[PDB]
C-alpha cells in the first residue's frame, strides 16, 4: 500500500492520473520523482522548468554543480539528485527530444532507468515540448518499466485520449 490516490490502473505496475506533477509531488512526497531532463540539466521549461521553479531554483543550482563535475548526461541516461522539497530523490531522465532530431528508439533506454527504483512518480518521457507522440510514450512505458510507476499527465484532454486509446 502507498499514498498515491485517484489513479487509473493500466497494468499490474503502471498507473495514471490527470494531475500536475508539481502538485502531486508536494502532496505525496514520493521517494522518487522523475524529471523530464535534458543532457545539460538546464531546467528551463516543460516539466523540468516547473519542477525547478517549485524548488525555488535549488534544483538548478544542484544540477549546475553536477554538470560542472561530471559533464552532460547521455540521451537515454539519468542521474539521481536531491528531490528538494518535492521528493526524497529526483531521477533526472533524458528522453529523446524529437525537436532536436534525436532517435526515438532511445525512449526505451530512457524508461529502463525507472527499473532501478521500486516506485516512482513520473511524467511521460519525451512528451510535451520533447515532441514525441504521448500515446507512443505510454506504450513504451508499459512495455519497458517493471517497477511501480505513477504517471501524471498535466493536460486533461490528453489524459482522456491516453486512457481511451490504451490497449
Ligand atoms: C509542463 C508540466 C508541468 N507539470 C507537469 N506535470 C506533468 N506533465 C507535464 N508535462 C508533460 C505531459 O504530461 C506529457 C504527457 S501529455 C501532457 C504533457 C507537466
Ligand atoms: Cl511538457
Curated annotation (Swiss-Prot):
Compartments where found: Host endoplasmic reticulum membrane
Lipid bilayer topology: Multi-pass membrane protein
Coiled coil: none
Domain of life: Viruses
Activation and inhibition: Inhibited in vitro by GRL-0617.
Catalytic activity, reaction form: Thiol-dependent hydrolysis of ester, thioester, amide, peptide and isopeptide bonds formed by the C-terminal Gly of ubiquitin (a 76-residue protein attached to proteins as an intracellular targeting signal)
Consequence when changing residue 31 to A: In strain: Mu/B.1.621
Macro domain residues: 1-167
Quaternary organization: May form homohexamers. Interacts with N protein.
Described function: Responsible for the cleavages located at the N-terminus of the replicase polyprotein. Participates together with nsp4 in the assembly of virally-induced cytoplasmic double-membrane vesicles necessary for viral replication. Antagonizes innate immune induction of type I interferon by blocking the phosphorylation, dimerization and subsequent nuclear translocation of host IRF3. Also prevents host NF-kappa-B signaling. In addition, PL-PRO possesses a deubiquitinating/deISGylating activity and processes both 'Lys-48'- and 'Lys-63'-linked polyubiquitin chains from cellular substrates.
Protein name (Swiss-Prot/TrEMBL): Papain-like protease nsp3
Source organism of the structure: Severe acute respiratory syndrome coronavirus 2
Part of the intact protein present: 1025 to 1191 of 7096
